[model samples]
Target chain A: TKLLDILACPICKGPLKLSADKTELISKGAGLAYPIRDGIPVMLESEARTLTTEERLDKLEHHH
Target chain B: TKLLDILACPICKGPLKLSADKTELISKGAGLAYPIRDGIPVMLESEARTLTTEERLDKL
Candidate 1:
């Protein structure tokens, strides 16, 4: 969890936090999903996926 | 160690193992050191540092 706080978006260079699934690091600032496999976070921007509208909405709903 | 087995170098897409320092992922194939900041592995190649001769040998 401590790592969650320290990670930043490779794109925006803004802060990033873990997703609910704990399988991705979400950067709302970048609207990207940096996948995590077997606990190793893959933070490369080129490897990251753009967050879909539904996914972003779900995250917002989950947060609130 | 479980994660070490599962992770691969973003550059070479080859296997990556934890370094002795426990602070970087050593991808010998890529010859890069992906830093581990606060326990999260930063796998960006641009963020990665090139491994030196001694460092590469040490990983082996």
Candidate 2:
């Protein structure tokens, strides 16, 4: 999506990568998952879903 | 909205206050404005609208 290209992590202002399904934006720096609803990115940190340490570690190791 | 209570500013992880019209979430710390479309908050810093110094001052 054109919007996703310009979207940044709300918590760290870092570049965001899309999920496999494109329903979420994963912020590696913040270890949070921001949901995209109805094509609009819901990027609030508070509303973001926290990733487990293992999930974080695994992602980092894999760099997915 | 129940969701807004838990939502924080993505940049600073600071609490967010809503606009009077309730269509936007104002992040004072990040100095950004997150829009709400179809009742969903769009919180990306890049997607967010930058808050002017005057607007920031006026808001806080």
Candidate 3:
């Protein structure tokens, strides 16, 4: 069950990490998470939100 | 032409419109009777729709 694990953050051009259920792709460098809807990546960055340090940590804990 | 011109609503920092070649893409913003072809715009405000207070414009 190798998800489409290889993707780059649109803003920072950094690697993206796969989500737990393999539904969301998180880019720590860009503070953006792209969703995989029906196996499709919604790769829009204008809708990205800046995450606080605490939020980032929580996401990391939840995913890893 | 920079259809995506410096977009800012004259009234506020709301939004702006660029000129288009139709009445199809009606801007709820300040509109002008401009012509639009396809999904592009003819950004004019005189032709916009001042929806009633009951009308909720789509943003997010």
Candidate 4:
């Protein structure tokens, strides 16, 4: 269940945490977290986001 | 190990180049690259793609 945390953002090589979900993954890099479900990473374009300044600050240095 | 070579970035769904050996995935997008290990994509969303101006032009 917790394997998601240890997973690095597939783009930044940074850490990833669940996005208010048991299926979505957030990448503070995109500030736009991607989704995952049924053990599959969705990685859709419409589902992504650009990181806001504040949001980026919040995620910069957290250790996984 | 072979999956690492052909796997695309989960986000961009773009071509994913292997990083170093078989441990990381690099997306010229987001100008960043992620890592994989033990058969895991390791796509944390943090490891995402952001194409640079030059790279973006190249990719486009």
Kindly list the per-residue Cα lDDT of model 2 for residues B1-60, writing each as its tens digit: 233444577788786777666667788888888986633566678789887878678533
User: Who wins the lDDT comparison?
Assistant: 1
Model 2 regions more than 4 Å off: A1-64, B58-60
Worst 10 residues of 2 chain A by lDDT: A1-10
What digit string (tens of lDDT, one per residue) describes model 3 on residues A1-64? 1112223576776766665555556777777776654323455676444555864774453545
lDDT scores in order = 0.72, 0.69, 0.45, 0.55
- Per-model TM against the reference: 0.49, 0.44, 0.37, 0.36
Ten residues in sequence with the least summed lDDT for candidate 3 chain B = B1-10
Clash number by candidate, in order: 0, 6, 20, 22
Chain B TM-score of predicted candidate 1 relative to the true chain B: 0.83
Candidate 3: where is the Cα deviation over 4 Å?
A: A1-6, A47-52, A58-64, B1-60
**Error in Å for residue A48 of model 4:** 2.7
Best model number under DockQ: 1
Question: lDDT by residue for model 1 over A1-64, one digit each (tens)?
Answer: 2334445677787777666656777888888988887545777778888989886664353545
Q: Which lDDT tens digits does candidate 2 get at residues A15-48?
A: 6777666667788888998886643466788778
- lDDT by residue (B1-60, candidate 1, tens digit) is 233444578888788766666677788898899987744677788889898989767534
Native contacts retained by model 2, as a fraction? 0.03
- Model 4's DockQ score: 0.03
- Please list the residue runs of candidate 4 whose C-alpha ends up more than 4 Å from where it truly belongs after superposition: A44-47, A51-64, B1-60
State residue A56's C-alpha deviation in candidate 3, in Å.
2.3
Residues A1-64 of candidate 4: C-alpha lDDT, one tens digit per residue: 2344345665666666565534456677556666654344655547666656776675456675
